[PDB]
Ligand binder design. Structure first.
Ligand SMILES: Nc1ncnc2c1ncn2[C@@H]1O[C@H](COP(=O)(O)OP(=O)(O)O)[C@@H](O)[C@H]1O
Ligand code: ALF
Lengths: 285, 971, 31
C-alpha cells in the first residue's frame, strides 16, 4: 500500500516537481497570451478580415419558435403568451421614447431611398448617426392599440427581420420585367419580400396576406443599410416587415415560406434559413 | 526390444553388432524407411495468421467501432430522411485502416518467420554412427535402423537405442516420464516394462553424463517420442492493460457527459467510439512486430541464432556476463607445447624431423607418459586420414584428448595400434565434477601381466590421489621438495596461459588382482589411491581474435564480465589477463602479498579489485559471503568450478537483481544456461545439450556477436520507448478541447470525426516509422538499464507525454481555433458562455463582437472550419513532436536525418491533412472545410517552441549527466 | 467582401500541393 511517515509520500522534498510545473505552465500561459495579443493586433476592429462565411444573410422572425411551428388557441389567452411576450420584449427597443433626437438617433426618410453612406470605416469621425424606425409603419401589427399583435381574433402576425451584416448594402433585383413572379409597384430602394405556401395545397388556401412594410411596398427600405458595426453604430434599428394573415382556414398546419429576392441575396439547400424561412402555423379551438 | 540379448537384437536386423554397417545396406534401408524426422503438424496454421492478426491484437476495438458506425448509419437511414451520412465514410476508413494494419503486420511477421525457418534448418543434429568400424559426424536425419550408434555425455540421443555397452551413462528424459532426474543406464535389462528399464534410451533424450554404445531399434515417427514469457512482453502487456483501462474510463466519462449535454444517442455513441479509439495506441503491436523483424534481419546478417526474438531485449538489458574459459573465450584448438617429467621442463618437439632434440624420446619415464596419454584418450581419427599431416588431421572427441592424441601420433607413433595392443578392460569417462578420467589396460609383455590403471585429469586431483613419482624410470615417494618443485613448474607453465593436465598410473598387483577380475563402473573396487605420478602436459590455448575487442566493448557498456571456469586459478588468471577480464594494473590479494612480502591474512582484502577465488573454497562459502565477493570486487574470476558451483554463482549474481547472461559450450555449462536469464551457446564447439538449453546460438563461433546482440537489444528498447512517447502525446490535445468546451461553454473546438482523423493520420504511420529508426552514438556508452526502476513506461515518460508536450499541442490547437474564430468575427472575449446559444438549432440571430448576426448553419460552417484548423495544427505540431522523439539523449543535428521512412510518414500525414480539407465535396462527407493558406502557419510558432525546448533539454542532459534533469525529465 | 475569393482556387491549389507532397513522400523511400 501507499507508505507514509517514514520517508515521504513517494518522494522527499515534493516542492521540486510542483515548482517546475508551476513555472512551465506560467511561461506557457504567458507565451499563449502574448501570441493571442499579437494576433489581435492584426485583426481590424471596425470590420472583419473574412466575411464569406456570412454569405447573404438569412431572414428570421421575432416569434422565435422552438419547434419551427406556431400553435395556439384564441380561446386561451395563455396559449399565445409565449409568442406575444417574446414579440413585445424585442419590440420594446423600437418605442418612440427610446429613439430620441440629439446626436444619438436621427430623423430619417418616410419614403424608401438609396443606402446612406456614412463615410469610410476609419475612425476619422465619431459614432455614426442612426435612422429611426417607428411602430406606426408596422401599422395594425404593432401594439399601438391592443398589445396582442393578433393572436386574439385574427391569426398570428409574424414580423420578418434581416440579419445584420457589416457594411452590406443589398441591391433590389434588376430587370424587373420578369423577376420570375410579378410584383406590384416595382421600385428600387426596396428589397422585395414575399410570403407564400410551400406545397401546392399550401400555395393556395393560405388566404390573403397583407404586408405591413414601409412605404406601401412589401420589402426592406435601403435607407438604413449599410450596418456599420456595434462599436460604430450602437443602438442600430434595422428595418422590420410585418405580415398578417387576415383570413384563412383553421385547425390545419399551413406551411409558408417567406423568400426575399435580390441580386446580393443567395440561397443554400443546406441552410434552410438563409434568405428564406419556413413556418408551420395552425390555430386550435 | 528389451528382453532379448545383444546377439538376438543384432541378428534380428542382420547387422554387425560389433563393427557396424557398411554403406551397401545403409542406402537401401534408408530408402525403405526414409529419413527419421519426427512428424511436424499436418502442414502449418495456414491463412489463419492473417485473420488472427487483423482480428486479434489491439484491433478488436477498431472492429467494434467500425461495425457500430455502420449500424449507426443504418439506423440513421432507417429513420426520418437524414441524407448526410457522416458515418459510412468513417466506417470505410476505419475498416481500411484495420485491414492495412493487419496486412502490414502479417507481411512483417512472415518476413521474420522466413528467417526463423531458415535458422532452424541451418544447424542440424548429428550422431557418431559407426560404419565400417569408424565414427563419422553423420546428420541425425540420416541414421537408419540397424547401424551402431555411440552416445557421448552432453549430446542429444539421435533415436531409440538398444544399449550394448555403457559406462556410467545417465539419461535425462524430462519428456516421457516427467522425472527430470537423470537415470543410470546399463546393458542389462532390469524391468519387463520398456518405459522404465535401464537398457533402452528414448528418442530426443539427451545423455547428460557418461558414454555408451548401442544399436538403434526405432527411428522416425515410429519411435517412443513419435507416438506421445519475457520481461519485455510482460511490460508491453501491463502497459496495454493500463492504457486500455484509462481509455475506457475516459470514454465512459465522456459518454456520460455527452448524455447530460444531450447531443443525441448516435452522436454520443460515435463520440464514445472516437474517444476510445483515439486514447489507445493501436500502433504498438505493429511497431513491436517491425522491431522484431528488424532484429531478426540484423541477426541473420551475421549468422546468430535467436530462439525467441524477444530475448534480444533481455540481452540488451544485461548487466553481468559469465563466460567459460576454453571453447568460448579460446578457440578450443590446442596443441602440446611444454611437458614436465623427472624434475625438468621439456619443450614439445612438434616437428616431424625432431629439429632441436629438446627432449629425449627414449627414456622410460617418457615411454610411460606416452603410454598414459595414448591409452587414456577416447579420441579417434577419421576415415581416410592416412594421407593427411598429423597436425591437419581431423580428430573426433573433446579438444583436450584430440590434442593429446595428435601429439602422441606425431611424437610416439601409432595411437590406434598401441590401443589395440593393450586391451582395455575398464573405463570411467571424464566428468566435470570428477575432473579426472581413468581406464585400466592390460600389459602386452607377458613377463608380468600386471593390470595398468591409467589416470589423467586436473593436476591437483592427481597429486592428491598419487603418492610416488617416476624419476628417470625409478619410483620414489612425493617429497616436500618434490612437491615444491612440481608447484614451481606448474606456476611457470600457468604464467604462459596454457592448459596443463596431470598424468599418473599404477601397476595393479597380481596376488590381489587376478587375471579374471570383474570391475565395476559404479562400485569402486579399484585402488584409486597412492598412485605413481608421471608428469604434466601443457597445451597452447589461443584466445579468439575478436575476444579482446568484444570484452573491451562490453565492459565499456557498463556490463561486468565474470570468467567462471573449471581450470586452475593460475591458468584462468593468465587467460583473463590475455583477453582483458583483468585489465593491466588491476591487482589481486595474492599479488599484494607477493609484492609486499607479507602474509595474505595480514593483507586487507580491500586494496585488491580482482579476485581469483578457488572452487573448493566455494563449497565453504555461504550466500552472504558470495554476495560480499560479488559486491566488493569489480573484476571477478572464478576458477576450478563444478557445474553445480556454476549454477550457484549464477543464482548469487541473480540475487542482486542484475540481469546475468551465461555463455558456454560444454555439458558443464548446461545448468547455468538453464538458470541464467539469457543463455548463449557456441555453435561449432558447443555441445548439443548446451545449445538446446541456451536462448542464443553463435553459428560462426565469434565472441564479438554478443556485443552486437546487446547493441540490438538496447536499440529495440529505445525504439519502443520513443514510439510510446510519440504516440502518447496526442492524447491530451483531444480530451482537452472537449474539457474546455464543457468548462467554459465555448463552441466545440474538436469534433469526433477530426479526433479519429488525427488518430489515424498522426499516431498510425509515424508510430511504426519510429521503429525503423537507427541507433544513436550513446547506445554502447550508457549504463545498462535497471529493470526494476527504468521500466518501458514510467512516471517520467507519462509526464513528458501528457503535461509537457500534450499541453503544448493542445495550446497550439486552441490558438488555431481562436484565430479562426476571431478572423471570422468572434473575438475571444465574448466566447465564454456562448455554447448554449451557439448549439441551438432555432437561434439564427446570434450576435458577435462586431454586431453581425449569424444563422445556425452559417456559424456551424465556421465551427467546422475551426475543427479542420485544429486538425491541421495538431498535424503541424506533431511534425516537431516526431522530430524530437527521434532521439533520446543526443541532438537531432548529431543524430542526423538518415531515416527515410520518417520523412515518408511526415509527408504522408501532411498530404492527408491537405487532401482531407481541400478536396471538393468533402464539406458534406466528413464536415471538413477548406482553410486559408494564412491559417497553415498558426502552429508554426508552437512547433518551433517544442523543438527548441526539447533540444535545450537534451543539451542539458548531455552537459550535466546525473543532474535533476536526468532524474525527473529523462524518460 | 462577401463574394468568396480564396476557394474554387484554394481547392485546386491545395490539391496540387497535396499531390506534390504525396509524390515526394512516395518517391523518397524508393530512391
Ligand atoms: N578431456 C579430459 N580428459 C581428462 N582430463 C580433463 C579433460 N578435460 C579437462 N580435464 C581437466 O578437467 C579440468 C576442468 O575441466 P571441466 O570442468 O570439465 O571444464 P573446463 O576445463 O573447460 O573448465 C580441467 O582443468 C582439465 O585439466
Ligand atoms: F571451459 Al568449459 F565447458 F569449455 F568449462
Amino acid at each position: 500500500s501507499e507508505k507514509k511517515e517514514f520517508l515521504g509520500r513517494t518522494g522527499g522534498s515534493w516542492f521540486k516537481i510542483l515548482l517546475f510545473y508551476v513555472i512551465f505552465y506560467g511561461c506557457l500561459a504567458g507565451i499563449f497570451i502574448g501570441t493571442i495579443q499579437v494576433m489581435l493586433l492584426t485583426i481590424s476592429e471596425f470590420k472583419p478580415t473574412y466575411q464569406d462565411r456570412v454569405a447573404p444573410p438569412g431572414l428570421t422572425q421575432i416569434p422565435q419558435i422552438q419547434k419551427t411551428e406556431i400553435s395556439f388557441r384564441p380561446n386561451d389567452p395563455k396559449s399565445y403568451e409565449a409568442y406575444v411576450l417574446n414579440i413585445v420584449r424585442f419590440l420594446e427597443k423600437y418605442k418612440d421614447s427610446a429613439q430620441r433626437d440629439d446626436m444619438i438617433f436621427e430623423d430619417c426618410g418616410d419614403v424608401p431611398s438609396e443606402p446612406k453612406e456614412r463615410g469610410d470605416f476609419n475612425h476619422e469621425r465619431g459614432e455614426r448617426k442612426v435612422c429611426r424606425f417607428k411602430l406606426e409603419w408596422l401599422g395594425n401589427c404593432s401594439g399601438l392599440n391592443d398589445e396582442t399583435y393578433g393572436y386574439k381574433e385574427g391569426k398570428p402576425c409574424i414580423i420578418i427581420k434581416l440579419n445584420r451584416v457589416l457594411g452590406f448594402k443589398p441591391k433590389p433585383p434588376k430587370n424587373e420585367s420578369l423577376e420570375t413572379y410579378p410584383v406590384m409597384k416595382y421600385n428600387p430602394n426596396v428589397l422585395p419580400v414575399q410570403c407564400t405556401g410551400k406545397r401546392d395545397e399550401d400555395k393556395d388556401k393560405v388566404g390573403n396576406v397583407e404586408y405591413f412594410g414601409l412605404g406601401n411596398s412589401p420589402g426592406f427600405p435601403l435607407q438604413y443599410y449599410p450596418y456599420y458595426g456595434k462599436l460604430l453604430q450602437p443602438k442600430y434599428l434595422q428595418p422590420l416587415l410585418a405580415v398578417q394573415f387576415t383570413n384563412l382556414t383553421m385547425d390545419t398546419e399551413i406551411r409558408i415560406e417567406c423568400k426575399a429576392y435580390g441580386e446580393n441575396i443567395g440561397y443554400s439547400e443546406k441552410d434552410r434559413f438563409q434568405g428564406r424561412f419556413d413556418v408551420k402555423i395552425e390555430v386550435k379551438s | 526390444e528389451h528382453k532379448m540379448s545383444v546377439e538376438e537384437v543384432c541378428r534380428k536386423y542382420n547387422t554387425d553388432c560389433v563393427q557396424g554397417l557398411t554403406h551397401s545396406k545403409a542406402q537401401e534401408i534408408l530408402a525403405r524407411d526414409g529419413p527419421n524426422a519426427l512428424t511436424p503438424p499436418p502442414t502449418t496454421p495456414e491463412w489463419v495468421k492473417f485473420c488472427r492478426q487483423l482480428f486479434g491484437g489491439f484491433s478488436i476495438l477498431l472492429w467494434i467501432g467500425a461495425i457500430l458506425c455502420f449500424l449507426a448509419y443504418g439506423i440513421q437511414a432507417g429513420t426520418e430522411d437524414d441524407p448526410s451520412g457522416d458515418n459510412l465514410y468513417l466506417g470505410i476508413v476505419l475498416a481500411a485502416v484495420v485491414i492495412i494494419t493487419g496486412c502490414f503486420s502479417y507481411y512483417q511477421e512472415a518476413k521474420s518467420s522466413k528467417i526463423m525457418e531458415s535458422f532452424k534448418n541451418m544447424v542440424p543434429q548429428q550422431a557418431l554412427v559407426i560404419r565400417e568400424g569408424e565414427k563419422m559426424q553423420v546428420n541425425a536425419e540420416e541414421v537408419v535402423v540397424g547401424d551402431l550408434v555411440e552416445i557421448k555425455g552432453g549430446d542429444r540421443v539421435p533415436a531409440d537405442l538398444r544399449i550394448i555397452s555403457a559406462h556410467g551413462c545417465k539419461v535425462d528424459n524430462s519428456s516421457l516420464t516427467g522425472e527430470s532426474e537423470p537415470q543410470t543406464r546399463s546393458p542389462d535389462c532390469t524391468h519387463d516394462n520398456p518405459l522404465e528399464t535401464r537398457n533402452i534410451t528414448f528418442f530426443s533424450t539427451n545423455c547428460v553424463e557418461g558414454t555408451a554404445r548401442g544399436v538403434v531399434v526405432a527411428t522416425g515417427d515410429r519411435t517412443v517420442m513419435g507416438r506421445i514469457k519475457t520481461p519485455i512482453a510482460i511490460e508491453i502487456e501491463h502497459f496495454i492493460q493500463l492504457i486500455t483501462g484509462v481509455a475506457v474510463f475516459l470514454g465512459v466519462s465522456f459518454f456520460i457527459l455527452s448524455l447530460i449535454l444531450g447531443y443525441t444517442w448516435l452522436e454520443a455513441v460515435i463520440f464514445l467510439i472516437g474517444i476510445i479509439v483515439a486514447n489507445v495506441p493501436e500502433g504498438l503491436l505493429a511497431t513491436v512486430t517491425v522491431c522484431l523483424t528488424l532484429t531478426a534481419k540484423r541477426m541473420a546478417r551475421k549468422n546468430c541464432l535467436v530462439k525467441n526474438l524477444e530475448a534480444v531485449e533481455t540481452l540488451g538489458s544485461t548487466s553481468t556476463i559469465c563466460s567459460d574459459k576454453t571453447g568460448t573465450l579460446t578457440q578450443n584448438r590446442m596443441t602440446v607445447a611444454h611437458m614436465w617429467f623427472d624434475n625438468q621442463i621439456h619443450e614439445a618437439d612438434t616437428t616431424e624431423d625432431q629439429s632441436g632434440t629438446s627432449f629425449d624420446k627414449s627414456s622410460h619415464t617418457w615411454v610411460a607418459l606416452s603410454h598414459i596419454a595414448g591409452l587414456c584418450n577416447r579420441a579417434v581419427f577419421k576415415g581416410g586420414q592416412d594421407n593427411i599431416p598429423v597436425l591437419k588431421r581431423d580428430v573426433a572427441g573433446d579438444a583436450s584428448e584430440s590434442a593429446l592424441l595428435k601429439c602422441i601420433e606425431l611424437s610416439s607413433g601409432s595411437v590406434k595400434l598401441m590401443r589395440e595392443r593393450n586391451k582395455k578392460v575398464a573405463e570411467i569417462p571424464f566428468n566435470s565434477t570428477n575432473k579426472y578420467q581413468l581406464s585400466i589396460h592390460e600389459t602386452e609383455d607377458p613377463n608380468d601381466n600386471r593390470y595398468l590403471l591409467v589416470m589423467k585429469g586436473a593436476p591437483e586431483r592427481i597429486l592428491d590421489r598419487c603418492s610416488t613419482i617416476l624419476l628417470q624410470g625409478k619410483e620414489q615417494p612425493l617429497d616436500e621438495e618434490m612437491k615444491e618443485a612440481f608447484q614451481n613448474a606448474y606456476l611457470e607453465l600457468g604464467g604462459l596461459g596454457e592448459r596443463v593436465l596431470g598424468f599418473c598410473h599404477y601397476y595393479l598387483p597380481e596376488e590381489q588382482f587376478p587375471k579374471g577380475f570383474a570391475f565395476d563402473c559404479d562400485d569402486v573396487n579399484f585402488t584409486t589411491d597412492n598412485l605413481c605420478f608421471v608428469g604434466l602436459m601443457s597445451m597452447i590455448d589461443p584466445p579468439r581474435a575478436a575476444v579482446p575487442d568484444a570484452v573491451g566493448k562490453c565492459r565499456s557498456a557498463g556490463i561486468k564480465v565474470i570468467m567462471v571456469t573449471g581450470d586452475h586459478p593460475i591458468t584462468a588468471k593468465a587467460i583473463a589477463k590475455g583477453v582483458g577480464i583483468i585489465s593491466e594494473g588491476n591487482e589481486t590479494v595474492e599479488d599484494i602479498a607477493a609484492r609486499l612480502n607479507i602474509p595474505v591474512s595480514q593483507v586487507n582484502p580491500r586494496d585488491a579489485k580482482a579476485c581469483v577465488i578457488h572452487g573448493t573454497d566455494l563449497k565453504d562459502f555461504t550466500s552472504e559471503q558470495i554476495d560480499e565477493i560479488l559486491q566488493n570486487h569489480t573484476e571477478i574470476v572464478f576458477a576450478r568450478t563444478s557445474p553445480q558451483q556454476k549454477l550457484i554463482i549464477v543464482e548469487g549474481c541473480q540475487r542482486q537483481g542484475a540481469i546475468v547472461a551465461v555463455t558456454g559450450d560444454g555439458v558443464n555449462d548446461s545448468p547455468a544456461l538453464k538458470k541464467a536469464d539469457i543463455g548463449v551457446a557456441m555453435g561449432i564447439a558447443g555441445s548439443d545439450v548446451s545449445k538446446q538449453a541456451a536462448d542464443m546460438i553463435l553459428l560462426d563461433d565469434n565472441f564479438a556477436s554478443i556485443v552486437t546482440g546487446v547493441e540490438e537489444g538496447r536499440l529495440i528498447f529505445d525504439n519502443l520507448k520513443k514510439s510510446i512517447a510519440y504516440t502518447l502525446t496526442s492524447n491530451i490535445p483531444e480530451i482537452t478541447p472537449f474539457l474546455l468546451f464543457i468548462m467554459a461553454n465555448i463552441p466545440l473546438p474538436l469534433g469526433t470525426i477530426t479526433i479519429l482523423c488525427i488518430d489515424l493520420g498522426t499516431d498510425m504511420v509515424p508510430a511504426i516509422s519510429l521503429a525503423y529508426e537507427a541507433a544513436e552514438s550513446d547506445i554502447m556508452k550508457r549504463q545498462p538499464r535497471n529493470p526494476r526502476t527504468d521500466k518501458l513506461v514510467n512516471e517520467r515518460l507519462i509526464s513528458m507525454a501528457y503535461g509537457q508536450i500534450g499541453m503544448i499541442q493542445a495550446l497550439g490547437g486552441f490558438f488555431s481555433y481562436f484565430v479562426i474564430l476571431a478572423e471570422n468575427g468572434f473575438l475571444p472575449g465574448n466566447l465564454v458562455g456562448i455554447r448554449l446559444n451557439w448549439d441551438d438549432r432555432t437561434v439564427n440571430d446570434l450576435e458577435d463582437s462586431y454586431g453581425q448576426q449569424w444563422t445556425y448553419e452559417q456559424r456551424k460552417v465556421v465551427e467546422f472550419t475551426c475543427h479542420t484548423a485544429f486538425f491541421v495544427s495538431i498535424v503541424v505540431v506533431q511534425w516537431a513532436d516526431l522530430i524530437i522523439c527521434k532521439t533520446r539523449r543526443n541532438s537531432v543535428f548529431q543524430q542526423g536525418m538518415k531515416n527515410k521512412i520518417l520523412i515518408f510518414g511526415l509527408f504522408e500525414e501532411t498530404a492527408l491533412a491537405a487532401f482531407l480539407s481541400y478536396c471538393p465535396g468533402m464539406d458534406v462527407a466528413l464536415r471538413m472545410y477548406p482553410l486559408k493558406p494564412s491559417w497553415w502557419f498558426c502552429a508554426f510558432p508552437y512547433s518551433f517552441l517544442i523543438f527548441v525546448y526539447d533540444e535545450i533539454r537534451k543539451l542539458i542532459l548531455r552537459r550535466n549527466p546525473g543532474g535533476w534533469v536526468e532524474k525527473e525529465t529523462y524518460y | 467582401d462577401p463574394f468568396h475569393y480564396d476557394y474554387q482556387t484554394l481547392r485546386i491549389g491545395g490539391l496540387v500541393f497535396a499531390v506534390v507532397l504525396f509524390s515526394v513522400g512516395i518517391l523518397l523511400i524508393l530512391s
